[PDB]
Amino acid sequence: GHETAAQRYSARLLQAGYMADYLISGGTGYVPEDGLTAQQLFASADGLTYNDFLILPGFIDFIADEVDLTSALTRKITLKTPLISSPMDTVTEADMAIAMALMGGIGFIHHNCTPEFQANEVRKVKKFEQGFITDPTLKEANAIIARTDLKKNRDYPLASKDSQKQLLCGAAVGTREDDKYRLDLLTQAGVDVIVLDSSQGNSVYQIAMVHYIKQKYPHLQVIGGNVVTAAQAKNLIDAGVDGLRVGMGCGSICITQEVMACGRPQGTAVYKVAEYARRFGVPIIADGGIQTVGHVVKALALGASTVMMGSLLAATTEAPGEYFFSDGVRLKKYRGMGSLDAVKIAQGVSGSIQDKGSIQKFVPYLIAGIQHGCQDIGARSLSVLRSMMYSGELKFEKRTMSAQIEGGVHGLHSYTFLPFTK
Amino acid sequence: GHETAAQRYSARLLQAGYMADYLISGGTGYVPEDGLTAQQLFASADGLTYNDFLILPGFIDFIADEVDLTSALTRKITLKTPLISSPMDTVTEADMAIAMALMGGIGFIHHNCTPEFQANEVRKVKKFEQGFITDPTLKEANAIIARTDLKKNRDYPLASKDSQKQLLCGAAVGTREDDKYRLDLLTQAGVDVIVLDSSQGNSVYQIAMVHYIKQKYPHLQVIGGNVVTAAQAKNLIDAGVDGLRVGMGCGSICITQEVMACGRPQGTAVYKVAEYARRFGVPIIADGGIQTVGHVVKALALGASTVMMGSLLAATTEAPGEYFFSDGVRLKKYRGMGSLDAVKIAQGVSGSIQDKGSIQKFVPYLIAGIQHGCQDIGARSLSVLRSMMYSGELKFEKRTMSAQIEGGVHGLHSYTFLPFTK
Amino acid sequence: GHETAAQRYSARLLQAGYMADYLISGGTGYVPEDGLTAQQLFASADGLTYNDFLILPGFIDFIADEVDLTSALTRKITLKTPLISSPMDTVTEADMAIAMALMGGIGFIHHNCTPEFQANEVRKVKKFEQGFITDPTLKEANAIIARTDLKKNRDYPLASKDSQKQLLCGAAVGTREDDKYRLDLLTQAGVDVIVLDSSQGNSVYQIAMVHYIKQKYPHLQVIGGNVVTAAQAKNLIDAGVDGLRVGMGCGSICITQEVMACGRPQGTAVYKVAEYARRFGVPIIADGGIQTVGHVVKALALGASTVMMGSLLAATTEAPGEYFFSDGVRLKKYRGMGSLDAVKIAQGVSGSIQDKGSIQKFVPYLIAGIQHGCQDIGARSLSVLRSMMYSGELKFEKRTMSAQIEGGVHGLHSYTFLPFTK
Ligand SMILES: NC(=O)c1ccc[n+]([C@@H]2O[C@H](COP(=O)([O-])OP(=O)(O)OC[C@H]3O[C@@H](n4cnc5c(N)ncnc54)[C@H](O)[C@@H]3O)[C@@H](O)[C@H]2O)c1
Ligand SMILES: NC(=O)c1ccc[n+]([C@@H]2O[C@H](COP(=O)([O-])OP(=O)(O)OC[C@H]3O[C@@H](n4cnc5c(N)ncnc54)[C@H](O)[C@@H]3O)[C@@H](O)[C@H]2O)c1
Ligand SMILES: NC(=O)c1ccc[n+]([C@@H]2O[C@H](COP(=O)([O-])OP(=O)(O)OC[C@H]3O[C@@H](n4cnc5c(N)ncnc54)[C@H](O)[C@@H]3O)[C@@H](O)[C@H]2O)c1
Ligand SMILES: Nc1nc2c(ncn2[C@@H]2O[C@H](COP(=O)(O)OP(=O)(O)OP(=O)(O)O)[C@@H](O)[C@H]2O)c(=O)[nH]1
Ligand SMILES: Nc1nc2c(ncn2[C@@H]2O[C@H](COP(=O)(O)OP(=O)(O)OP(=O)(O)O)[C@@H](O)[C@H]2O)c(=O)[nH]1
Ligand SMILES: Nc1nc2c(ncn2[C@@H]2O[C@H](COP(=O)(O)OP(=O)(O)OP(=O)(O)O)[C@@H](O)[C@H]2O)c(=O)[nH]1
Ligand SMILES: Nc1nc2c(ncn2[C@@H]2O[C@H](COP(=O)(O)OP(=O)(O)OP(=O)(O)O)[C@@H](O)[C@H]2O)c(=O)[nH]1
Ligand SMILES: Nc1nc2c(ncn2[C@@H]2O[C@H](COP(=O)(O)OP(=O)(O)OP(=O)(O)O)[C@@H](O)[C@H]2O)c(=O)[nH]1
Ligand SMILES: Nc1nc2c(ncn2[C@@H]2O[C@H](COP(=O)(O)OP(=O)(O)OP(=O)(O)O)[C@@H](O)[C@H]2O)c(=O)[nH]1
Ligand SMILES: O=c1[nH]cnc2c1ncn2[C@@H]1O[C@H](COP(=O)(O)O)[C@@H](O)[C@H]1O
Ligand SMILES: O=c1[nH]cnc2c1ncn2[C@@H]1O[C@H](COP(=O)(O)O)[C@@H](O)[C@H]1O
Ligand SMILES: O=c1[nH]cnc2c1ncn2[C@@H]1O[C@H](COP(=O)(O)O)[C@@H](O)[C@H]1O
């Protein structure tokens, strides 16, 4: 079980020079109560997003580099990094999925393509790094073996690998009858995990699909389609999903709230669905609305096990399509899967995003920002962070609008922002 | 009464393979409580508009195309679509009224014109589609009969018709003595329903008019002029109106709040007047402030039986007047009936709206968006939607300002929005 | 720090036969929230006594006999039992003080007597069990040594002893100038600890006395005379007391509330003064209003380190004075120190109490009742109990009057109560 700020502070005073105190409170230790708990924070029933609150700083007794980012993707899959690339056709094909797996996250390949194309993109990921090449003890390396996989293994210390030392790959499927043929090809191609990709996952079509998959492929991991209430999470956990995607109407390319009136503010949705799903041991993906490393840290602190990004990974070099320069700045398209670009009504807008270079120079920046966020909180790992949140030890503070203005840049005439140097 | 999400989910699990549970709860089923009810939502006494809240998603066991939109306009008139065109001189004359009646709603012809002109515009609507042409068993189709009316029937399966197979038409009148002569001509022209068109309907002039109409034309339907409180709704329901228009100071061309200090935020007004009016079996029109299909779904979920649009139908081809290209885009004028364009003080601003093409290519888009909004809620019809709201099954969530920013488009460089493809 | 119910339950499931769960919550474990915390309980600002609330049951993974009752009397004195006999002339002289010291608590000898008499009663306690009799390695047991003290050791394994193997004794003094000579005699007699014994301890007279004692006898332990607010506790902790007595106007012989309007309900007083005093490492004595072993457990759970009894120890055989049979039942007198039996106004009533036999057959009953109360809470010690209270793990429930009626004996015709059999 996790150690409280007072316990750590006492052990560190005790390692050094600088009875009734133990007998009185028995190692709980007086700390002045300040801020709110997640429970109090969300009792008000305002609709909070990530911008509406702050996390209060804690006690530091470690450096940032030693923060453990190990996360559950599902009941059975673990990642060394909490980051996931979204199953969108402007975000995740084999190159993005390979890159995310190498940096210790995972990518879900999109399904706005033919079944044979998606299965080939999955096979490209599973082929990229190899133990024994059986279709040309594994300790014999230092069927075929090649030193290039030892170089990959050296160069990428966090890489998400299966038992055969191949990269992990996810894929999307819908809830239509012809998705049964996709899933046959994807399970032949060696896919590790599935997302069912509904905008609203609490449906007979999705529940029938979850029961069909758990019957035909009982070793396959399945993640529930998008939910934002505990009542939706109940029926998918009772259908036997191994994880959930959380978020509806948030996400930068989205218009579903203004078209359909359904959705939820993403902070409350992540907190409420995670606080329900933990009772059954089910991990949460927080999906959409992630603009900054502070949104990743907030999503994780509210109980998300992993964070899924669309826009923040769009216009990296590994994202699908090509750059086009049109506005006098280097731009790549980013479309939304319910745009009419991707009666039928649009659920999303098709747009464009400025260039960010490679995933491999940008994900270690998100990792470093998550570690430094966890260090100022006093969390030695992400499991310790969620543990402190559920126990009340972690404190929160609501923001007014003037407070959010004050949390940005003020009356400078001009400024330059450089986020990271190397 | 309607069936609950747990009842529907249980029947669906029961149609298939996948005792104490029934004996304990009597089939109610456990659903984790999440969100607010309309009652809790409006207990806070903040002034909520449609932008200030969301509807939480439900349980889906049907496709969107089978959502029933049948609505009550008054105690005795039913429409197959909840949409009404507003009685403004830049919105509703015979062409708009014909188009709305044909797509399954109704139009109220404006009164900023002579009594003889308004009666001629009403007669143009009542003539457009005919059964027995008596002024050149009806199943004789397959005293004159024309096949063009059979074609009209074939092409418009939701047309709002009277017993004689003619389109429904509404008209406006004021509460002056000379409005008694208008109403003689309009009832000779065959008008089906009246609106009394006040800014503030709770007046002796209006109550005297409602009593005069119900005395002279006892078969005529009358809709009360604008109200925003239950105390105003009481005196008009007691005078014997068959419906109410709800909204004061909202509506895109309006300035009444800044000029007069009177009004109400339209969400609260629709909820509070509809909650009162249902006790007497009186339908509500939600009038003004409708910018999106999500505003229509929200207005209907709060208890409105029908929704009346000005701006959203302005600059369609059937809207009065001509296009004029002035700002480098095709524009039509949209004036507000208390603008000085239409001491005398302005209640509204005269302005301009961009072209949208025909009502007949734009109303099936609003219908499709209402159906998809009701599908994500779990409502098989609009009646079921309002039933779930009054019974607490439907849940709501308030939005902060950062939450409404998150419900729009985020840090895209640029975006294109196409609302519908066909 | 203490281990939580979820942590203990998980280790006990783990010792036996009957991953994402650890990665999600960091071992905190889901437990459904129920009841109130001490903080919430006292936020209401009602005046709660011990009868107004209950402690909610926890998780058991130990037997009662292994509950540790070790307690702090002051910053430097520890007792193996949390029970103290009150400094009243119908309760504590040498025989009661010897008996309490032998069963593992302590007695404070009363000051309603000459200084020489009080010093002789203190000397009688310090003489009773001896190590080296120097006024006729100590491992020499197996300058005089007697086997009777070895037998005393054998028979009383919880006796409160000093370094010289003598029983601990406390004494009372007032805050008058003539108490300076009294305290010189008590420190010659070998007293271990002092109580300053006031109705209202927050006075210049008591603060001047605390400063005088800490100057002249810097190794002597001093407990501050009675307080019921954090503002009173501040000035005595700042004067340098080593403990506080908490309670004003409670206590069975008391009338101070009806005479003076001052006091506090004893539950709130114990909670609020203990919550303040823990910030400085100062133990609390809960003083008066103890009628049942459940009052002792409640006082200790609210943050009291020890509990002081008057009435519950009155009319034991070791209590001062002689028995009488005036009402057919066997009785002793029990007087209150501000009664006029003990213009001047009474603060207390002089009365009578029924016989209970010896301290040595009645204190092991209070010990067994405290252990069984801590077992149902799931507290392995009193330190762990207070730790669970300050950390929110321990839950409370308020009682209505009908609830208190239901917590007693109901519609029986008659009943017999035997509290303990051996
Ligand atoms: N998370 C969001 O906020 C959000 C919102 C809108 C769209 N999207 C994305 O856009 C894409 C499309 O989402 P979607 O929800 O429109 O796809 P969808 O296929 O789940 O839903 C489209 C329609 O088809 C229906 N449907 C689904 N399976 C069916 C079946 N077997 N039989 C009959 N009807 C069936 C649905 O109920 C719905 O009316 C996905 O990539 C999704 O992630 C996401
Ligand atoms: N819903 C709104 O928020 C809103 C606000 C302002 C105007 N409007 C619209 O503008 C138009 C004008 O509305 P209006 O209310 O100003 O017109 P109105 O003629 O009803 O009211 C104008 C004034 O005349 C008075 N009046 C009405 N009947 C009278 C009678 N018989 N004898 C004496 N005085 C009488 C009214 O009390 C008011 O002082 C309408 O189309 C209306 O729908 C709407
Ligand atoms: N805890 C209670 O609820 C409570 C209430 C009343 C009495 N008592 C008990 O009864 C006994 C008497 O208590 P008490 O408070 O009346 O005794 P006390 O001597 O402390 O107070 C009596 C009066 O003398 C004053 N006084 C004290 N020291 C003084 C000094 N040096 N110079 C001048 N004035 C001084 C006090 O302020 C008060 O007015 C004690 O045993 C006490 O514990 C307890
Ligand atoms: N040789 C080989 N490599 C494979 C195959 N499938 C996957 N790989 C991967 O290909 C990667 C590249 O290895 P290299 O050492 O660069 O192979 P190479 O030098 O290009 O081999 P040549 O094609 O013979 O020139 C390794 O990480 C292998 O795991 C396969 O069928 N054959
Ligand atoms: N042939 C081959 N050997 C590998 C590969 N990955 C790891 N190994 C070897 O198998 C052993 C695995 O230990 P690690 O490399 O520490 O852990 P890992 O999880 O397998 O891989 P990394 O996450 O890349 O460190 C080492 O001897 C590796 O060199 C791979 O892709 N191909
Ligand atoms: N013929 C006729 N049609 C009417 C009259 N009043 C309304 N209508 C409508 O006119 C519509 C058009 O019918 P068409 O078949 O196009 O009539 P048409 O071919 O223009 O008739 P002609 O004028 O003889 O050329 C039908 O939907 C009728 O309901 C009327 O007095 N006479
Ligand atoms: N001459 C004529 N016959 C009609 C008209 N509308 C309906 N009918 C006929 O009268 C019957 C009505 O059929 P329906 O279409 O099912 O009922 P409806 O609601 O009036 O019309 P729809 O909206 O088209 O469904 C049918 O026998 C039609 O042929 C009309 O406008 N003109
Ligand atoms: N011998 C002795 N024992 C003392 C003295 N003060 C206290 N005691 C206690 O008295 C007890 C000794 O009891 P006994 O051995 O029976 O001595 P006694 O009570 O004097 O009985 P007799 O010797 O028979 O008169 C021990 O517990 C001592 O601690 C003292 O001055 N002398
Ligand atoms: N002569 C004498 N020896 C004692 C006395 N009390 C303890 N001792 C001795 O000193 C040691 C105390 O051991 P313990 O009995 O375990 O601990 P304690 O706190 O002193 O006393 P207990 O409560 O009996 O445990 C032992 O070696 C005893 O023999 C006493 O009262 N008189
Ligand atoms: O058309 C759409 N409408 C609504 N949400 C979408 C659509 N397409 C994708 N999404 C969601 O948007 C998320 C990306 O959000 P972003 O990272 O903030 O840009 C994805 O992971 C999907 O869950
Ligand atoms: O001059 C005016 N001032 C205030 N409200 C008006 C005026 N003229 C019309 N309205 C209202 O505005 C509604 C249209 O609102 P809109 O659809 O949001 O533009 C109409 O249906 C009337 O109820
Ligand atoms: O005369 C008095 N008036 C008020 N309180 C008293 C008086 N004498 C003693 N006390 C307090 O009463 C406590 C005993 O309470 P009891 O055990 O409930 O009877 C003592 O420990 C004192 O703190």
PDB file of N, CA and C in Angstrom, chain A residues 352-398:
ATOM      1  N   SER A 352      -6.739  20.858 -40.339  1.00  0.00           N
ATOM      2  CA  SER A 352      -5.294  20.700 -40.505  1.00  0.00           C
ATOM      3  C   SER A 352      -4.519  21.127 -39.265  1.00  0.00           C
ATOM      4  N   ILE A 353      -3.329  20.559 -39.096  1.00  0.00           N
ATOM      5  CA  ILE A 353      -2.468  20.689 -37.920  1.00  0.00           C
ATOM      6  C   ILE A 353      -1.047  20.996 -38.394  1.00  0.00           C
ATOM      7  N   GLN A 354      -0.332  21.857 -37.671  1.00  0.00           N
ATOM      8  CA  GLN A 354       1.060  22.204 -37.961  1.00  0.00           C
ATOM      9  C   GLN A 354       2.039  21.070 -37.611  1.00  0.00           C
ATOM     10  N   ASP A 355       3.100  20.913 -38.404  1.00  0.00           N
ATOM     11  CA  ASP A 355       4.149  19.903 -38.225  1.00  0.00           C
ATOM     12  C   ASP A 355       4.821  19.922 -36.835  1.00  0.00           C
ATOM     13  N   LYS A 356       5.046  18.737 -36.262  1.00  0.00           N
ATOM     14  CA  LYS A 356       5.743  18.498 -34.982  1.00  0.00           C
ATOM     15  C   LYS A 356       6.978  17.589 -35.067  1.00  0.00           C
ATOM     16  N   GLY A 357       7.417  17.165 -36.250  1.00  0.00           N
ATOM     17  CA  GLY A 357       8.539  16.225 -36.372  1.00  0.00           C
ATOM     18  C   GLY A 357       8.163  14.795 -35.979  1.00  0.00           C
ATOM     19  N   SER A 358       9.112  13.962 -35.560  1.00  0.00           N
ATOM     20  CA  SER A 358       8.830  12.548 -35.275  1.00  0.00           C
ATOM     21  C   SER A 358       8.241  12.290 -33.888  1.00  0.00           C
ATOM     22  N   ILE A 359       7.479  11.206 -33.767  1.00  0.00           N
ATOM     23  CA  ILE A 359       7.028  10.633 -32.495  1.00  0.00           C
ATOM     24  C   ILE A 359       8.222  10.382 -31.576  1.00  0.00           C
ATOM     25  N   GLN A 360       9.338   9.893 -32.102  1.00  0.00           N
ATOM     26  CA  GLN A 360      10.510   9.536 -31.305  1.00  0.00           C
ATOM     27  C   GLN A 360      11.270  10.722 -30.689  1.00  0.00           C
ATOM     28  N   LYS A 361      10.983  11.976 -31.074  1.00  0.00           N
ATOM     29  CA  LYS A 361      11.543  13.159 -30.454  1.00  0.00           C
ATOM     30  C   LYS A 361      10.514  13.905 -29.626  1.00  0.00           C
ATOM     31  N   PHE A 362       9.247  13.496 -29.687  1.00  0.00           N
ATOM     32  CA  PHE A 362       8.112  14.176 -29.071  1.00  0.00           C
ATOM     33  C   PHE A 362       7.489  13.354 -27.938  1.00  0.00           C
ATOM     34  N   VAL A 363       7.578  12.024 -27.976  1.00  0.00           N
ATOM     35  CA  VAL A 363       7.030  11.208 -26.903  1.00  0.00           C
ATOM     36  C   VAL A 363       7.939  11.264 -25.683  1.00  0.00           C
ATOM     37  N   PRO A 364       9.295  11.278 -25.792  1.00  0.00           N
ATOM     38  CA  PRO A 364      10.137  11.442 -24.606  1.00  0.00           C
ATOM     39  C   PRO A 364       9.947  12.798 -23.913  1.00  0.00           C
ATOM     40  N   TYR A 365       9.488  13.824 -24.629  1.00  0.00           N
ATOM     41  CA  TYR A 365       9.022  15.073 -24.033  1.00  0.00           C
ATOM     42  C   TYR A 365       7.734  14.911 -23.205  1.00  0.00           C
ATOM     43  N   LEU A 366       6.719  14.187 -23.691  1.00  0.00           N
ATOM     44  CA  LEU A 366       5.528  13.890 -22.893  1.00  0.00           C
ATOM     45  C   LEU A 366       5.876  13.039 -21.673  1.00  0.00           C
ATOM     46  N   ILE A 367       6.734  12.029 -21.823  1.00  0.00           N
ATOM     47  CA  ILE A 367       7.236  11.222 -20.707  1.00  0.00           C
ATOM     48  C   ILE A 367       7.914  12.111 -19.661  1.00  0.00           C
ATOM     49  N   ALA A 368       8.845  12.976 -20.057  1.00  0.00           N
ATOM     50  CA  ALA A 368       9.523  13.884 -19.140  1.00  0.00           C
ATOM     51  C   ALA A 368       8.566  14.865 -18.444  1.00  0.00           C
ATOM     52  N   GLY A 369       7.582  15.415 -19.154  1.00  0.00           N
ATOM     53  CA  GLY A 369       6.561  16.269 -18.562  1.00  0.00           C
ATOM     54  C   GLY A 369       5.639  15.534 -17.588  1.00  0.00           C
ATOM     55  N   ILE A 370       5.243  14.292 -17.875  1.00  0.00           N
ATOM     56  CA  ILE A 370       4.493  13.460 -16.923  1.00  0.00           C
ATOM     57  C   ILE A 370       5.344  13.186 -15.686  1.00  0.00           C
ATOM     58  N   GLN A 371       6.626  12.831 -15.837  1.00  0.00           N
ATOM     59  CA  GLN A 371       7.467  12.562 -14.677  1.00  0.00           C
ATOM     60  C   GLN A 371       7.618  13.793 -13.800  1.00  0.00           C
ATOM     61  N   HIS A 372       7.818  14.978 -14.376  1.00  0.00           N
ATOM     62  CA  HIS A 372       7.977  16.195 -13.588  1.00  0.00           C
ATOM     63  C   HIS A 372       6.667  16.637 -12.928  1.00  0.00           C
ATOM     64  N   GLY A 373       5.525  16.451 -13.591  1.00  0.00           N
ATOM     65  CA  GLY A 373       4.218  16.605 -12.967  1.00  0.00           C
ATOM     66  C   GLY A 373       4.024  15.667 -11.776  1.00  0.00           C
ATOM     67  N   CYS A 374       4.401  14.392 -11.894  1.00  0.00           N
ATOM     68  CA  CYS A 374       4.260  13.471 -10.776  1.00  0.00           C
ATOM     69  C   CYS A 374       5.236  13.787  -9.658  1.00  0.00           C
ATOM     70  N   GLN A 375       6.422  14.314  -9.957  1.00  0.00           N
ATOM     71  CA  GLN A 375       7.383  14.673  -8.927  1.00  0.00           C
ATOM     72  C   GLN A 375       6.893  15.836  -8.055  1.00  0.00           C
ATOM     73  N   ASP A 376       6.342  16.910  -8.623  1.00  0.00           N
ATOM     74  CA  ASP A 376       5.818  18.039  -7.833  1.00  0.00           C
ATOM     75  C   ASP A 376       4.599  17.689  -6.968  1.00  0.00           C
ATOM     76  N   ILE A 377       3.828  16.678  -7.366  1.00  0.00           N
ATOM     77  CA  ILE A 377       2.755  16.068  -6.572  1.00  0.00           C
ATOM     78  C   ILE A 377       3.304  15.173  -5.445  1.00  0.00           C
ATOM     79  N   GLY A 378       4.509  14.625  -5.582  1.00  0.00           N
ATOM     80  CA  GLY A 378       5.079  13.664  -4.640  1.00  0.00           C
ATOM     81  C   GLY A 378       4.696  12.204  -4.898  1.00  0.00           C
ATOM     82  N   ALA A 379       4.230  11.874  -6.100  1.00  0.00           N
ATOM     83  CA  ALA A 379       3.867  10.530  -6.513  1.00  0.00           C
ATOM     84  C   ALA A 379       5.073   9.857  -7.147  1.00  0.00           C
ATOM     85  N   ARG A 380       5.510   8.749  -6.566  1.00  0.00           N
ATOM     86  CA  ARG A 380       6.650   8.027  -7.101  1.00  0.00           C
ATOM     87  C   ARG A 380       6.298   7.176  -8.318  1.00  0.00           C
ATOM     88  N   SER A 381       5.013   7.002  -8.617  1.00  0.00           N
ATOM     89  CA  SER A 381       4.540   6.272  -9.784  1.00  0.00           C
ATOM     90  C   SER A 381       3.104   6.688 -10.058  1.00  0.00           C
ATOM     91  N   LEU A 382       2.577   6.248 -11.197  1.00  0.00           N
ATOM     92  CA  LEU A 382       1.197   6.581 -11.533  1.00  0.00           C
ATOM     93  C   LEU A 382       0.209   5.798 -10.689  1.00  0.00           C
ATOM     94  N   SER A 383       0.523   4.559 -10.309  1.00  0.00           N
ATOM     95  CA  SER A 383      -0.304   3.783  -9.377  1.00  0.00           C
ATOM     96  C   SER A 383      -0.361   4.434  -8.000  1.00  0.00           C
ATOM     97  N   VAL A 384       0.762   4.966  -7.509  1.00  0.00           N
ATOM     98  CA  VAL A 384       0.812   5.757  -6.277  1.00  0.00           C
ATOM     99  C   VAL A 384      -0.020   7.027  -6.425  1.00  0.00           C
ATOM    100  N   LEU A 385      -0.009   7.685  -7.583  1.00  0.00           N
ATOM    101  CA  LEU A 385      -0.820   8.868  -7.817  1.00  0.00           C
ATOM    102  C   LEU A 385      -2.301   8.553  -7.681  1.00  0.00           C
ATOM    103  N   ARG A 386      -2.818   7.546  -8.394  1.00  0.00           N
ATOM    104  CA  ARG A 386      -4.246   7.186  -8.310  1.00  0.00           C
ATOM    105  C   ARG A 386      -4.633   6.698  -6.925  1.00  0.00           C
ATOM    106  N   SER A 387      -3.747   5.962  -6.280  1.00  0.00           N
ATOM    107  CA  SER A 387      -3.860   5.566  -4.882  1.00  0.00           C
ATOM    108  C   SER A 387      -4.030   6.763  -3.934  1.00  0.00           C
ATOM    109  N   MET A 388      -3.222   7.818  -4.074  1.00  0.00           N
ATOM    110  CA  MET A 388      -3.361   9.030  -3.275  1.00  0.00           C
ATOM    111  C   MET A 388      -4.643   9.776  -3.595  1.00  0.00           C
ATOM    112  N   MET A 389      -5.106   9.706  -4.839  1.00  0.00           N
ATOM    113  CA  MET A 389      -6.369  10.350  -5.174  1.00  0.00           C
ATOM    114  C   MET A 389      -7.546   9.631  -4.525  1.00  0.00           C
ATOM    115  N   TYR A 390      -7.638   8.306  -4.641  1.00  0.00           N
ATOM    116  CA  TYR A 390      -8.749   7.560  -4.045  1.00  0.00           C
ATOM    117  C   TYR A 390      -8.734   7.594  -2.514  1.00  0.00           C
ATOM    118  N   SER A 391      -7.568   7.719  -1.879  1.00  0.00           N
ATOM    119  CA  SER A 391      -7.464   7.822  -0.423  1.00  0.00           C
ATOM    120  C   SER A 391      -7.709   9.224   0.154  1.00  0.00           C
ATOM    121  N   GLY A 392      -7.916  10.278  -0.653  1.00  0.00           N
ATOM    122  CA  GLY A 392      -8.059  11.610  -0.133  1.00  0.00           C
ATOM    123  C   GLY A 392      -6.768  12.358   0.092  1.00  0.00           C
ATOM    124  N   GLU A 393      -5.617  11.714  -0.058  1.00  0.00           N
ATOM    125  CA  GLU A 393      -4.368  12.409   0.227  1.00  0.00           C
ATOM    126  C   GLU A 393      -4.098  13.502  -0.796  1.00  0.00           C
ATOM    127  N   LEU A 394      -4.415  13.244  -2.053  1.00  0.00           N
ATOM    128  CA  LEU A 394      -4.257  14.221  -3.111  1.00  0.00           C
ATOM    129  C   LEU A 394      -5.380  15.243  -3.043  1.00  0.00           C
ATOM    130  N   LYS A 395      -5.012  16.516  -3.138  1.00  0.00           N
ATOM    131  CA  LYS A 395      -5.940  17.625  -2.992  1.00  0.00           C
ATOM    132  C   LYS A 395      -6.062  18.408  -4.287  1.00  0.00           C
ATOM    133  N   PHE A 396      -7.243  18.967  -4.521  1.00  0.00           N
ATOM    134  CA  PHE A 396      -7.566  19.661  -5.750  1.00  0.00           C
ATOM    135  C   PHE A 396      -8.058  21.055  -5.421  1.00  0.00           C
ATOM    136  N   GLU A 397      -8.020  21.917  -6.418  1.00  0.00           N
ATOM    137  CA  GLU A 397      -8.481  23.281  -6.267  1.00  0.00           C
ATOM    138  C   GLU A 397      -9.205  23.658  -7.539  1.00  0.00           C
ATOM    139  N   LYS A 398     -10.405  24.199  -7.410  1.00  0.00           N
ATOM    140  CA  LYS A 398     -11.133  24.699  -8.563  1.00  0.00           C
ATOM    141  C   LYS A 398     -10.564  26.040  -9.009  1.00  0.00           C
TER     142      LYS A 398
END
